Structure formats: structure tokens, C-alpha cells
Amino acid sequence: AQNPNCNIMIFHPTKEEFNDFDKYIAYMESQGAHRAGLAKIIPPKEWKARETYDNISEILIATPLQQVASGRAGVFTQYHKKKKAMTVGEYRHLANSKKYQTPPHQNFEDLERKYWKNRIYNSPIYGADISGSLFDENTKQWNLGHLGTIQDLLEKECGVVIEGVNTPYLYFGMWKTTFAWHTEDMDLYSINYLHLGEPKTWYVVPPEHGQRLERLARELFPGSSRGCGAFLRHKVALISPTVLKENGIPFNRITQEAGEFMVTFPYGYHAGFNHGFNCAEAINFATPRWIDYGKMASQCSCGEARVTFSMDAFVRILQPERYDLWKRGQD
């Protein structure tokens, strides 16, 4: 069995190897990459997403979200308070202001320390789930707007034509911008490209140990667990690496820098934070190996994980018994 310790693996494809997305994902798995639940892919030196990032200031963040925490430093939830619209230009200026700018620090480990010590006492603001792409139309390899669709994958494997179409999303982040512990909708894969700016630190639990994380979360968020059998679908809960370690939860961490891809794997619980102003793009995708994960994915029916019409068909076909209950949760 490849990668038995479930380490996060890092890949350096050549130009040739970067020419077939599906084929390279299969190759990573053949090396045991998926056991970690996350991998890093460094593109070939000659590759670029786009020419420059000089004309992105006019993109609109219709609904910036201020992330307000409740709890204690290492075990907290956050909620999203809606702010007034701002351009990326305005957002960037805000990220860089005294109130929100990255503090001076020694290195990534020093910033991580400061994040977990201090995050709860501040409320950073971010631009989430903005439909769009910063990949140049002419970029042919690993263009996140040019991947095969989950709908076509599902139809190829199962022979059922379904409505829906998934497209990439943009994220604009600042120091302390926080991604709560979660797996992807329907436990899909995800791919995340960091277009520009400061790093993102990721935490990941191996898919084979996902239930250990769920068990701990039930204990640490007892009221949340009571209200919903799949409350991590709400994407509001944070647990520090110190608390994970204290409770024996297997996990790994890695820092993504601008110009790097990260792929998350079916049922890989992940969380993280932004080091400072950045912009990332992400999309879900599927392979034949995802199908069985999609069939077993936990669903929120309490109304607190509203997703989209796009997920309707996946629940409808892969989980007929859960569909009705899920649906009315969506109503």
C-alpha cells in the first residue's frame, strides 16, 4: 500500500505530465497521494495562469463577509456577518491597513502560533464563492474553468443524464481569514490555485480517519451536534492543531504559496487560514473513484447547509433514500 503514513505528498510535473489533468490525478493516487486527503502540485517552470494580475482591481465582491468567532482560542465557531460591496482594489487596501495587515513574524511556524493564539479576538473580512475565473482563456493546461464537469463524469459512469453545471469560484482573503473544518459537497474532490499574494496554511485529516475528527467535533460542539447529524456541513467549526494532537487525531499541515495548486481528495476533512491579502480560485471535480464516496456522503437536512440546485441531482441519483429529507431541509 502506497503512502501508509498518509503524508501530504508534493508533486513536480514536467510539461509533458501537465498535459492531461485526469491522467495526472490518477498518477498521484497510484503514488498514494489521496491517503493524506490533500496534495500539493507545483506547476512546470514554464507554465502561467495568466500574463499578469494588474487589471483585477475592478472585480466586485458583492457581499464581503466578516468572520466573527465564539468560543476559546483552540475550539471556536464563526459566523459570517454581511458587509457592504467593495471592489478587489478596495478590499486589498483594507487587507493592508493597520487594522488587518499581517503582523511582523519570524516564519510560517511563528505566524501559525500567532493565528491560533489571537484569531478569536479579531474579525477578518473576506470575499467568498464569487463565481468567476482568473485563468487566461489561452492557458491550456490546468485551467480550472476548462475541466470536465461532475455532471458529465456522473453520466459517463452511471449512464444518467442530469441537469446542472459547475464553474470555478474566486476567493479574496486577508490575514486570519479562516476556513472551517469540512469535506467538499458530496465529498467531491477540490482543486485550489493560489493566484496571488500571501500564503494559505492548510490542515487535513486522512480520509481513512475522517470519523475520528467527527467524533471529536461532536464532543467539542455538543449543542451543534445535537441540532444536526452532519453539522460539519455548516462549515463553522475550528479546532487547533494543539487540540487535535491532545485528542490523538491524525492530521497533517502544509503551506500553499502563490503559483501552487492544492488538490483535496474525497472525504478529506480540511481547514485553514490566509497569511495576508491573497486571491485563490477553486472548483470541485470528480473521478470514477469518487462515485462510491458520493453515495456514502453525509448530508445536512437541518437547513444550515444551503448549497445549490447543482447538488440536487447528485443527491437525487446517488442517494435516493436521503433525497426527500435533504430536499425539505433545502426548503
Report the residue from 29, 90, 304, 312 that binds Zn ion according to the rule CB under 5 A.
304
Asked whether position 254 contacts Zn ion by CB under 5 A, the answer is: no
What is the gyration radius of the CA atoms in the chain, in angstroms?
19
C-alpha–C-alpha distance, residues 141 and 159, integer Å:
28
| Nearest distance, CB of residue 308 and Zn ion, angstroms | 16
The x, y and z cell numbers of residue 41, run together, are 502540485
Report the residue from 88, 300, 311, 315 that binds Zn ion according to the rule CB under 5 A.
300
Stretch that binds Zn ion, among 97-105, 188-196, 211-219, 297-305 (CB under 5 A): 297-305
C-alpha–C-alpha distance, residues 121 and 267, integer Å:
31
Q: Which residues contact 54 (CB under 8 A, 6 or more apart)?
A: none
Total residue count of the chain as it appears in this document: 331
The x, y and z cell numbers of residue 210, run together, are 475522517
Whether 115 has a binding-site annotation, put simply, is no
Element (H, E) at 158: helix 150-158
C-alpha–C-alpha distance, residues 74 and 329, integer Å:
31
Stretch that binds Zn ion, among 44-52, 165-173, 280-288, 302-310 (CB under 5 A): 302-310
Cβ closest to Zn ion, residue 257 vs residue 304: 304
Helix intervals (H) in 221-273: 222-227, 241-246
Binders of Zn ion in range 133-152 (CB under 5 A): none
Whether 6 has a binding-site annotation, put simply, is no
Contact pattern from residue 174 through residue 213 relative to Zn ion, giving x for each residue in contact according to CB under 5 A and a dash for the rest: ----------------------------------------
Stretch that binds Zn ion, among 8-16, 29-37, 103-111, 222-230 (CB under 5 A): 222-230
CA atoms within 13 A on the CB side of 230: 21
C-alpha–C-alpha distance, residues 195 and 216, integer Å:
34
Whether 80 has a binding-site annotation, put simply, is no
Cβ closest to Zn ion, residue 182 vs residue 200: 182
| Nearest distance, CB of residue 43 and Zn ion, angstroms | 37
Q: Which amino acid is at 241?
A: P
Q: How many residues of this chain interact with Zn ion, rule: CB under 5 A?
A: 4
Binders of Zn ion in range 223-252 (CB under 5 A): 228
Which of 124, 44, 134, 27 is CA-nearest to residue 80? 124
Q: Are 283 and 144 in contact (CB under 8 A)?
A: yes
- Dihedral, CA of residue 299, residue 302, residue 306 and residue 312, to nearest 10: 50
The neighbour count for residue 240, using CB atoms within 10 Å, is 20
Stretch that binds Zn ion, among 122-130, 241-249, 293-301, 314-322 (CB under 5 A): 293-301
| Nearest distance, CB of residue 63 and Zn ion, angstroms | 22
Stretch that binds Zn ion, among 2-10, 32-40, 66-74, 296-304 (CB under 5 A): 296-304
Whether 235 has a binding-site annotation, put simply, is yes
Q: Which segments are annotated as binding site for Zn(2+)?
A: 228, 234, 300, 302
Residues that bind Zn ion (CB under 5 A): 228, 300, 302, 304
Q: Which segments are annotated as binding site?
A: 126, 182, 184, 192, 200, 228, 234-235, 270, 300, 302
